[PDB]
């Protein structure tokens, strides 16, 4: 096949993407070895769904797992009556998700399970796939003429031909695997044919962070989780926390081989040690550096000029409320809290009004990084750690290091009950989630 | 007695004001005629209670009326567990109100019934009295050397030696009386002995407005409902709506007699007419002018200089929520609404957080003036009708003419359930009231 492995794409046809997927244990070849993973559509990652605004999506999920499951349409501003975080599809049963893709939407989104208490092992085992919303902006020459690829960043650990089981320490830290893969491949080679690449990036890992850097090159950020920036932003590196997406332009500068790496990053994961009268928690420290892929530049690369503008960011109404959500940890118990409470599906934590804007100040009073995710209602990050964000774009996950406060501008869109939670999915399963009702 | 009648004063003693009042039908002489009014303490108005910050008040109210009653400590930022708008004292029974006067407080406040559905006839019949909180500011020379008086502005109508009964039109408009009295006296004479007067003003009427003007003189506003201004404000006239208080300095300019008048004012009260195929509501138009009192200046008056400053207004924390409360009318039904609902004592309408600040936008979409009152939590009026307020001071009633929006900064103080309502008390009795819970 193509030197660069990417998930198969399923496109809407005549404004309709109608598809039946099965969630199923699937024997496959992965990183040179045979394993049984849990997959959608028989593959890992699952198929990439590619749609346009105003398309109808009709996705029937058949559950062929031995446990209940469901889907979260991560990042899509649709109704929580469709993207329903409380729905359970029992083993052997099916459910049809039907929705219209919002008019004002573009970017890279994804789908994965969200059945509380069961997310981490299901996601770890291979249940996820991408969803791309094509825009009219894709037709501008500076993007149209770029070579486009999706990079699904997901790690894995195998034991006895199956995903490794979660240990108690995994529930505390979030589970990371030794196989650090791109599109289910181990360090693939991307032999570029054009001098400008457009890369859609997805961190679909349970807990691993990717401090992205391409050797000898900057990256040009053109989209965040949920939409385009207003103009490209040059960065020397780009941190993607679990659940985050980004799109970047890469402008290949000369011929040669360039490593795309996940540089060392310390997200505050913990180990245990015993030093003569101890048995206490110790920092694992930064991750070991990983090579994600080999990028081979073409001969005599002459990249396109960058687009001067992308999408103007909407002018939001003045906010009508400020919320404060404080994240804390009980590491030895592997329990995680928002405002001193663990998740309770019966309890409503925040009640807001549709079509108003809120300011949410989310504060991490723990020692680990926590990537905070809100369903249904994409937000604008104003600042984090007291530092203003250098761009305007829609996001739906925001990373907070220890001690940091993020200030978010949150327009409330669809009515109904939905959730917010840490996207280190083990932490969500272990209680770090709350309920927002919009009326 | 003194040419100028003022209610008897009861003062705290050794930091304690301990007093038993009875609410009782009382034969008395009023405006030259004999009548039976409902009174506290056997008088109309009831006695003026005079206290200092940190005093203890212990007031036992004995109900000798044929209906239940209670007290509202109008304007006092105390607990709604004491100033309890839901408490009922049955006929023949007693209740003791005990509270400490807040440290940071000064001004003219008052007490009257607040038993929903029964306020208007009880207040109209004569149940009210003043409460004055003395401050250290009263010792400044420019105030100490002024001649001080309380003016309780309250009208009355008599029928068969008793307060006139409410008609259906009274429930629609709020009841006004033909006897327009000051301290229960008909057009008293105030023979000033000093050139500077300090007048504490209270509108304790059900519904009558007083567009105050002293002939040939401006007034110097030094306090609003719930505290001092930051410095005196010169005004040519001063409108006091039902429930409002003000304190003014008057600087007598020359010898002579000067009328203090209630000038014509149209608050939007309605009548009915039939003109050949009608039977429909017609504006009553402005009130007829009234003389409130005769002010006689002393010989060769040389008033004191005005104080340069009074009390700095507190710097409030940034607000965390904005509320919108819309007032509407159904005049022919004599029903009045807040956000489309009438009062229900079981229903909580707003839930806020103690020690935070809120912005309340109160909008009058009716045609009558409505004076909006909030219990427990004094507010700063920022603007009304889109016009910035010309001073900073604590208020607890704000008048809105037809169409006007008031923007208020509302620090939430004591925890508990309390109410907000129109202080045209007929409108409150007829539903224009809601419930705020502070937690
Ligand atoms: Cu997700
Ligand atoms: Cu977390
Ligand atoms: Cu979620
Ligand atoms: Cu009152
Ligand atoms: Cu009213
Ligand atoms: Cu009241």
PDB file of C-alpha atoms in Angstrom, chain A residues 160-348:
ATOM      1  CA  UNK A 160      -0.680 -12.220  25.484  1.00  0.00           C
ATOM      2  CA  UNK A 161      -1.884 -10.888  22.143  1.00  0.00           C
ATOM      3  CA  UNK A 162      -4.375  -8.494  23.737  1.00  0.00           C
ATOM      4  CA  UNK A 163      -4.380  -4.951  25.119  1.00  0.00           C
ATOM      5  CA  UNK A 164      -2.626  -4.986  28.480  1.00  0.00           C
ATOM      6  CA  UNK A 165      -5.008  -4.874  31.474  1.00  0.00           C
ATOM      7  CA  UNK A 166      -5.206  -1.749  33.674  1.00  0.00           C
ATOM      8  CA  UNK A 167      -3.229  -1.915  36.909  1.00  0.00           C
ATOM      9  CA  UNK A 168      -4.159   0.132  39.999  1.00  0.00           C
ATOM     10  CA  UNK A 169      -1.335   2.545  39.087  1.00  0.00           C
ATOM     11  CA  UNK A 170      -2.903   2.892  35.614  1.00  0.00           C
ATOM     12  CA  UNK A 171      -6.169   4.045  37.198  1.00  0.00           C
ATOM     13  CA  UNK A 172      -4.219   6.674  39.143  1.00  0.00           C
ATOM     14  CA  UNK A 173      -2.047   8.012  36.296  1.00  0.00           C
ATOM     15  CA  UNK A 174      -3.974   7.118  33.178  1.00  0.00           C
ATOM     16  CA  UNK A 175      -2.491   4.238  31.153  1.00  0.00           C
ATOM     17  CA  UNK A 176       0.351   4.755  28.661  1.00  0.00           C
ATOM     18  CA  UNK A 177       1.727   2.064  26.368  1.00  0.00           C
ATOM     19  CA  UNK A 178       5.189   1.278  25.040  1.00  0.00           C
ATOM     20  CA  UNK A 179       4.022   1.067  21.425  1.00  0.00           C
ATOM     21  CA  UNK A 180       3.790   4.699  20.379  1.00  0.00           C
ATOM     22  CA  UNK A 181       1.952   4.560  17.093  1.00  0.00           C
ATOM     23  CA  UNK A 182       0.734   6.776  14.288  1.00  0.00           C
ATOM     24  CA  UNK A 183      -2.419   5.520  12.572  1.00  0.00           C
ATOM     25  CA  UNK A 184      -1.820   2.154  14.237  1.00  0.00           C
ATOM     26  CA  UNK A 185       1.595   1.939  12.568  1.00  0.00           C
ATOM     27  CA  UNK A 186       4.987   1.850  14.305  1.00  0.00           C
ATOM     28  CA  UNK A 187       7.142   4.765  13.138  1.00  0.00           C
ATOM     29  CA  UNK A 188       5.840   4.946   9.537  1.00  0.00           C
ATOM     30  CA  UNK A 189       7.683   6.799   6.777  1.00  0.00           C
ATOM     31  CA  UNK A 190       5.922   9.714   5.120  1.00  0.00           C
ATOM     32  CA  UNK A 191       7.551  10.317   1.743  1.00  0.00           C
ATOM     33  CA  UNK A 192       6.258  13.784   0.878  1.00  0.00           C
ATOM     34  CA  UNK A 193       5.428  14.517  -2.733  1.00  0.00           C
ATOM     35  CA  UNK A 194       4.681  18.188  -2.163  1.00  0.00           C
ATOM     36  CA  UNK A 195       6.700  20.799  -0.283  1.00  0.00           C
ATOM     37  CA  UNK A 196       3.734  21.897   1.852  1.00  0.00           C
ATOM     38  CA  UNK A 197       1.972  19.356   4.058  1.00  0.00           C
ATOM     39  CA  UNK A 198      -1.341  19.878   5.790  1.00  0.00           C
ATOM     40  CA  UNK A 199      -1.452  17.587   8.804  1.00  0.00           C
ATOM     41  CA  UNK A 200      -4.590  16.923  10.833  1.00  0.00           C
ATOM     42  CA  UNK A 201      -3.471  15.769  14.288  1.00  0.00           C
ATOM     43  CA  UNK A 202      -5.493  13.803  16.825  1.00  0.00           C
ATOM     44  CA  UNK A 203      -4.401  12.683  20.272  1.00  0.00           C
ATOM     45  CA  UNK A 204      -6.619   9.634  20.826  1.00  0.00           C
ATOM     46  CA  UNK A 205      -4.477   8.226  23.629  1.00  0.00           C
ATOM     47  CA  UNK A 206      -5.884   7.530  27.114  1.00  0.00           C
ATOM     48  CA  UNK A 207      -3.249   9.637  28.840  1.00  0.00           C
ATOM     49  CA  UNK A 208      -0.036  10.031  26.814  1.00  0.00           C
ATOM     50  CA  UNK A 209       0.921  13.582  25.828  1.00  0.00           C
ATOM     51  CA  UNK A 210       2.707  14.456  22.582  1.00  0.00           C
ATOM     52  CA  UNK A 211       5.087  17.387  22.777  1.00  0.00           C
ATOM     53  CA  UNK A 212       5.367  17.594  18.997  1.00  0.00           C
ATOM     54  CA  UNK A 213       8.442  18.877  17.196  1.00  0.00           C
ATOM     55  CA  UNK A 214       9.608  18.300  13.636  1.00  0.00           C
ATOM     56  CA  UNK A 215      13.398  18.323  13.290  1.00  0.00           C
ATOM     57  CA  UNK A 216      14.749  21.539  11.798  1.00  0.00           C
ATOM     58  CA  UNK A 217      11.251  22.932  11.147  1.00  0.00           C
ATOM     59  CA  UNK A 218       8.624  25.071  12.830  1.00  0.00           C
ATOM     60  CA  UNK A 219       4.927  24.137  12.567  1.00  0.00           C
ATOM     61  CA  UNK A 220       2.189  26.509  11.373  1.00  0.00           C
ATOM     62  CA  UNK A 221      -0.942  26.051  13.475  1.00  0.00           C
ATOM     63  CA  UNK A 222      -4.044  26.655  11.366  1.00  0.00           C
ATOM     64  CA  UNK A 223      -6.739  24.884  13.410  1.00  0.00           C
ATOM     65  CA  UNK A 224      -7.384  23.951  17.036  1.00  0.00           C
ATOM     66  CA  UNK A 225      -9.735  21.276  18.376  1.00  0.00           C
ATOM     67  CA  UNK A 226     -12.921  22.627  16.884  1.00  0.00           C
ATOM     68  CA  UNK A 227     -12.130  25.058  14.096  1.00  0.00           C
ATOM     69  CA  UNK A 228      -9.649  27.234  12.245  1.00  0.00           C
ATOM     70  CA  UNK A 229      -7.536  29.987  13.746  1.00  0.00           C
ATOM     71  CA  UNK A 230      -7.969  33.489  12.291  1.00  0.00           C
ATOM     72  CA  UNK A 231      -4.545  33.299  10.672  1.00  0.00           C
ATOM     73  CA  UNK A 232      -1.634  30.844  10.825  1.00  0.00           C
ATOM     74  CA  UNK A 233       0.490  30.853  13.969  1.00  0.00           C
ATOM     75  CA  UNK A 234       4.159  29.812  13.825  1.00  0.00           C
ATOM     76  CA  UNK A 235       5.255  27.579  16.704  1.00  0.00           C
ATOM     77  CA  UNK A 236       8.503  25.746  17.455  1.00  0.00           C
ATOM     78  CA  UNK A 237       6.616  22.885  19.092  1.00  0.00           C
ATOM     79  CA  UNK A 238       3.037  21.884  19.814  1.00  0.00           C
ATOM     80  CA  UNK A 239       1.705  20.034  22.864  1.00  0.00           C
ATOM     81  CA  UNK A 240      -1.327  17.837  22.254  1.00  0.00           C
ATOM     82  CA  UNK A 241      -3.000  16.552  25.405  1.00  0.00           C
ATOM     83  CA  UNK A 242      -5.415  13.599  25.353  1.00  0.00           C
ATOM     84  CA  UNK A 243      -8.513  14.449  23.319  1.00  0.00           C
ATOM     85  CA  UNK A 244      -6.995  17.517  21.659  1.00  0.00           C
ATOM     86  CA  UNK A 245      -6.754  18.063  17.905  1.00  0.00           C
ATOM     87  CA  UNK A 246      -4.761  20.502  15.810  1.00  0.00           C
ATOM     88  CA  UNK A 247      -4.097  21.146  12.145  1.00  0.00           C
ATOM     89  CA  UNK A 248      -0.687  22.419  11.036  1.00  0.00           C
ATOM     90  CA  UNK A 249       1.054  23.368   7.833  1.00  0.00           C
ATOM     91  CA  UNK A 250       4.602  22.097   7.388  1.00  0.00           C
ATOM     92  CA  UNK A 251       6.806  23.916   4.904  1.00  0.00           C
ATOM     93  CA  UNK A 252       9.617  21.559   3.958  1.00  0.00           C
ATOM     94  CA  UNK A 253      12.814  23.584   3.758  1.00  0.00           C
ATOM     95  CA  UNK A 254      15.318  21.286   2.058  1.00  0.00           C
ATOM     96  CA  UNK A 255      15.756  17.690   0.934  1.00  0.00           C
ATOM     97  CA  UNK A 256      16.337  15.065   3.583  1.00  0.00           C
ATOM     98  CA  UNK A 257      14.921  12.958   6.391  1.00  0.00           C
ATOM     99  CA  UNK A 258      13.306  14.755   9.317  1.00  0.00           C
ATOM    100  CA  UNK A 259      12.039  13.061  12.478  1.00  0.00           C
ATOM    101  CA  UNK A 260       8.669  14.052  13.894  1.00  0.00           C
ATOM    102  CA  UNK A 261       9.179  13.479  17.614  1.00  0.00           C
ATOM    103  CA  UNK A 262       7.241  13.454  20.859  1.00  0.00           C
ATOM    104  CA  UNK A 263       9.751  15.327  23.018  1.00  0.00           C
ATOM    105  CA  UNK A 264      10.164  14.668  26.752  1.00  0.00           C
ATOM    106  CA  UNK A 265       7.236  16.005  28.747  1.00  0.00           C
ATOM    107  CA  UNK A 266       6.391  15.664  32.417  1.00  0.00           C
ATOM    108  CA  UNK A 267       2.637  15.508  32.976  1.00  0.00           C
ATOM    109  CA  UNK A 268       3.091  14.657  36.633  1.00  0.00           C
ATOM    110  CA  UNK A 269       2.541  10.881  36.502  1.00  0.00           C
ATOM    111  CA  UNK A 270       3.558   9.096  39.710  1.00  0.00           C
ATOM    112  CA  UNK A 271       5.404   5.978  40.783  1.00  0.00           C
ATOM    113  CA  UNK A 272       6.024   4.376  44.172  1.00  0.00           C
ATOM    114  CA  UNK A 273       9.286   3.843  45.965  1.00  0.00           C
ATOM    115  CA  UNK A 274      10.628   2.281  49.110  1.00  0.00           C
ATOM    116  CA  UNK A 275      13.982   3.686  50.300  1.00  0.00           C
ATOM    117  CA  UNK A 276      14.516   2.204  53.763  1.00  0.00           C
ATOM    118  CA  UNK A 277      11.422   3.323  55.640  1.00  0.00           C
ATOM    119  CA  UNK A 278       9.141   4.607  52.953  1.00  0.00           C
ATOM    120  CA  UNK A 279       6.539   3.328  50.544  1.00  0.00           C
ATOM    121  CA  UNK A 280       5.519   6.693  49.110  1.00  0.00           C
ATOM    122  CA  UNK A 281       4.703   8.386  45.817  1.00  0.00           C
ATOM    123  CA  UNK A 282       7.517   9.686  43.634  1.00  0.00           C
ATOM    124  CA  UNK A 283       7.346  11.594  40.330  1.00  0.00           C
ATOM    125  CA  UNK A 284       7.951   9.520  37.193  1.00  0.00           C
ATOM    126  CA  UNK A 285       9.338  12.702  35.660  1.00  0.00           C
ATOM    127  CA  UNK A 286       9.315  13.497  31.907  1.00  0.00           C
ATOM    128  CA  UNK A 287       8.406  10.925  29.258  1.00  0.00           C
ATOM    129  CA  UNK A 288      11.236   9.373  27.251  1.00  0.00           C
ATOM    130  CA  UNK A 289      11.544  10.950  23.786  1.00  0.00           C
ATOM    131  CA  UNK A 290       9.710   9.104  21.007  1.00  0.00           C
ATOM    132  CA  UNK A 291      10.029   9.144  17.259  1.00  0.00           C
ATOM    133  CA  UNK A 292       6.542   9.273  15.772  1.00  0.00           C
ATOM    134  CA  UNK A 293       7.380   9.151  12.053  1.00  0.00           C
ATOM    135  CA  UNK A 294      10.138   9.679   9.468  1.00  0.00           C
ATOM    136  CA  UNK A 295       9.387  12.536   7.094  1.00  0.00           C
ATOM    137  CA  UNK A 296      11.216  12.441   3.758  1.00  0.00           C
ATOM    138  CA  UNK A 297      11.193  15.773   1.901  1.00  0.00           C
ATOM    139  CA  UNK A 298      10.927  15.861  -1.911  1.00  0.00           C
ATOM    140  CA  UNK A 299      13.709  17.169  -4.159  1.00  0.00           C
ATOM    141  CA  UNK A 300      14.170  20.947  -4.273  1.00  0.00           C
ATOM    142  CA  UNK A 301      11.154  21.756  -2.069  1.00  0.00           C
ATOM    143  CA  UNK A 302       9.518  25.118  -2.737  1.00  0.00           C
ATOM    144  CA  UNK A 303       6.615  25.348  -0.305  1.00  0.00           C
ATOM    145  CA  UNK A 304       3.498  27.377  -1.040  1.00  0.00           C
ATOM    146  CA  UNK A 305       3.051  30.750   0.592  1.00  0.00           C
ATOM    147  CA  UNK A 306       1.027  30.582   3.816  1.00  0.00           C
ATOM    148  CA  UNK A 307      -2.569  31.718   3.589  1.00  0.00           C
ATOM    149  CA  UNK A 308      -2.834  35.294   4.908  1.00  0.00           C
ATOM    150  CA  UNK A 309      -6.118  34.635   6.659  1.00  0.00           C
ATOM    151  CA  UNK A 310      -8.207  31.621   7.603  1.00  0.00           C
ATOM    152  CA  UNK A 311     -11.550  32.125   9.406  1.00  0.00           C
ATOM    153  CA  UNK A 312     -12.593  35.221  11.380  1.00  0.00           C
ATOM    154  CA  UNK A 313     -13.493  34.173  14.921  1.00  0.00           C
ATOM    155  CA  UNK A 314     -17.100  35.032  15.916  1.00  0.00           C
ATOM    156  CA  UNK A 315     -17.711  38.122  18.061  1.00  0.00           C
ATOM    157  CA  UNK A 316     -19.302  36.692  21.208  1.00  0.00           C
ATOM    158  CA  UNK A 317     -22.015  38.380  23.322  1.00  0.00           C
ATOM    159  CA  UNK A 318     -20.987  39.682  26.759  1.00  0.00           C
ATOM    160  CA  UNK A 319     -21.040  36.874  29.351  1.00  0.00           C
ATOM    161  CA  UNK A 320     -23.806  36.624  31.966  1.00  0.00           C
ATOM    162  CA  UNK A 321     -22.166  34.352  34.532  1.00  0.00           C
ATOM    163  CA  UNK A 322     -18.769  33.269  35.843  1.00  0.00           C
ATOM    164  CA  UNK A 323     -18.243  29.720  37.088  1.00  0.00           C
ATOM    165  CA  UNK A 324     -15.349  28.288  39.075  1.00  0.00           C
ATOM    166  CA  UNK A 325     -14.488  24.600  38.822  1.00  0.00           C
ATOM    167  CA  UNK A 326     -11.616  23.327  40.949  1.00  0.00           C
ATOM    168  CA  UNK A 327      -9.890  20.041  40.174  1.00  0.00           C
ATOM    169  CA  UNK A 328      -8.339  17.987  42.994  1.00  0.00           C
ATOM    170  CA  UNK A 329      -6.772  14.536  43.446  1.00  0.00           C
ATOM    171  CA  UNK A 330      -6.600  11.700  45.919  1.00  0.00           C
ATOM    172  CA  UNK A 331      -3.786   9.815  44.188  1.00  0.00           C
ATOM    173  CA  UNK A 332      -3.424   6.837  46.515  1.00  0.00           C
ATOM    174  CA  UNK A 333      -7.168   6.211  46.265  1.00  0.00           C
ATOM    175  CA  UNK A 334      -7.178   6.921  42.519  1.00  0.00           C
ATOM    176  CA  UNK A 335     -10.096   9.281  43.092  1.00  0.00           C
ATOM    177  CA  UNK A 336     -10.467  12.578  41.280  1.00  0.00           C
ATOM    178  CA  UNK A 337     -12.805  15.478  42.011  1.00  0.00           C
ATOM    179  CA  UNK A 338     -14.458  18.606  40.687  1.00  0.00           C
ATOM    180  CA  UNK A 339     -15.395  21.096  43.431  1.00  0.00           C
ATOM    181  CA  UNK A 340     -14.876  18.378  46.012  1.00  0.00           C
ATOM    182  CA  UNK A 341     -17.286  15.890  44.402  1.00  0.00           C
ATOM    183  CA  UNK A 342     -17.114  12.803  42.197  1.00  0.00           C
ATOM    184  CA  UNK A 343     -19.502  12.256  39.301  1.00  0.00           C
ATOM    185  CA  UNK A 344     -23.122  11.295  39.986  1.00  0.00           C
ATOM    186  CA  UNK A 345     -25.279  10.874  36.890  1.00  0.00           C
ATOM    187  CA  UNK A 346     -28.379  11.843  38.874  1.00  0.00           C
ATOM    188  CA  UNK A 347     -26.930  15.121  40.131  1.00  0.00           C
ATOM    189  CA  UNK A 348     -26.951  18.351  38.125  1.00  0.00           C
TER     190      UNK A 348
END
